[PDB]
Amino acid sequence: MNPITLAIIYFTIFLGPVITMSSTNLMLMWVGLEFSLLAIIPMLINKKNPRSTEAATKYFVTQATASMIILLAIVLNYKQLGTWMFQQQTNGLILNMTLMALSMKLGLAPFHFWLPEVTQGIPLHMGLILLTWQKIAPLSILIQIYPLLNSTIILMLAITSIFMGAWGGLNQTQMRKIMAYSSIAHMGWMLAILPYNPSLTLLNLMIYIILTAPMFMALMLNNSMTINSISLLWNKTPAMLTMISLMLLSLGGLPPLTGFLPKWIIITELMKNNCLIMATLMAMMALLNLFFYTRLIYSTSLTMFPTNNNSKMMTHQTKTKPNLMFSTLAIMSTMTLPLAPQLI
């Protein structure tokens, strides 16, 4: 690509969600979602291979139908009330159709079958964007209408996302799919609590971003896309094992790391409203979500694997890849539990 094209496309990606936030009109929110859709595709398809073409096609076709369903909901609301804002006393069918379309946009189960494929079929960057910057505005729509939502199917979609993300990421050798299933489970955790104190949704979102972005950078630093490729890290970049370990053990919520904070306070604010046993199920399947992280950091850190003879050139040569924000994002994660009242 050329600089003017990159400026245009990245500015459009920045303005998609930024339009979706600073917009009372739901039509302009839809416009922002379409901006994100339209501008992400040139970078999913920048390498021009069959995997990239398939990923971009699946993304486009899955997101356009959800956009059209959200537009159906908006048009029905305008017909009902003569207003471009979801008031109260709308129709539950409208609100549920909106919620299902947004679930298809995010990747929540049972609308999840497209995210691992697409994340596999693209570079390490544009998986980061796809999993972090594209989850925000769809979440903004829900955040703005959290009292209107059905507490039933919001939780069914959550629970299904947790179960399917854990059971998907359990058996994936490819890391681009493990991060996608992690995204699915974390979005389940968010959307479970979204009708209850929606600030915790944004908390879990920021935690998830601050974990995943360093992880995708770690995979970038040697173009790692497989367990057997991240296992050859004690020979190439052996100073990253510590942070990778602590961040994976944060993603799988464990106490002293800040990745247990979202699950903990989410279970708290659910137990305040008698969502006891659903919270128990989610907390218990988060362990199955943690199992493959444990296996992963075994494979790379604790039982260092066989290496190759050609990996010694890598030892001779030098690197410049860590961007000075890897350390910051990995250290604000894994170490910011005592600041939890300053987070909530």
Binding site: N49, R51, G121, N171, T173
Partner: protein, 51 residues
């Protein structure tokens, strides 16, 4: 975990570039035939077209 269905799943490449069965360049074959006025009455002129 090899199921009965996933036994045939060969792993992917490393650069995310698959080796494909290269399709044939099956161009369109036209008869710029003798009846054609640009032809002088008696010219067949088979030709292959990519459009």
């Amino acid at each position: 975990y090899p199921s009965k269905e996933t036994a045939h799943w060969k792993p992917p490449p490393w650069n995310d570039v698959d080796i494909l069965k290269e399709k044939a360049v099956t161009n369109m074959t036209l008869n710029f035939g003798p009846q054609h006025p640009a032809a002088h009455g008696v010219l067949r002129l088979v030709l292959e077209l990519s459009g």
